[PDB]
DNA sequence: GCGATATCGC
DNA sequence: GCGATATCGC
């Protein structure tokens, strides 16, 4: 099993983020979700903490590859 | 990546066998919303020893293929 | 990961 | 507790 790729920032603050955009958007589409999780990280200004998630993220990754490849 | 892989379990094989019957009876059905209907249909079957005799027996090619898999140590 | 259900302890 | 096990976009 090639390992799967990691959560990007975005998606990482996206899962984080996916209860409170459906409380504010009642009945959204899973669809309708995404465009607004969109607006939202296209607003967020400071995004060190997801940057920062995603970065060790990457090295995780980076780690399971090179375990998936060398045995 | 090599190792067997571990059995399934009595409702994971009765939804796996189900799933596809599940879809086309709720056209376009999401698959978190599948699960969701899996569990209701397991919460109510009522008899799952066919499906427990699968699981049990998938166990079974599992423990066997696992003791060849370390039959060499 | 998570959403959606449910077991099992390589 | 959780990932694996199935599924399968996000
Ligand atoms: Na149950």
Redesign the interface.
């Known amino acids: 099993?090639?390992p799967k790729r990691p959560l990007s920032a975005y998606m990482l603050w996206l899962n984080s983020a996916r209860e409170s955009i459906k409380r504010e958007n009642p009945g959204i589409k899973?669809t309708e979700v995404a465009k607004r999780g969109g607006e939202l990280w296209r607003a967020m200004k400071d995004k060190s903490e997801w940057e920062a998630k995603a970065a060790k993220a990457k090295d995780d990754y980076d780690r399971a590859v090179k375990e998936?490849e060398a045995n």
Do not use: A, I, L
Request: net charge neutral; no cysteine; proline share 0%.
């Open positions: 099993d090639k899973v998936f």
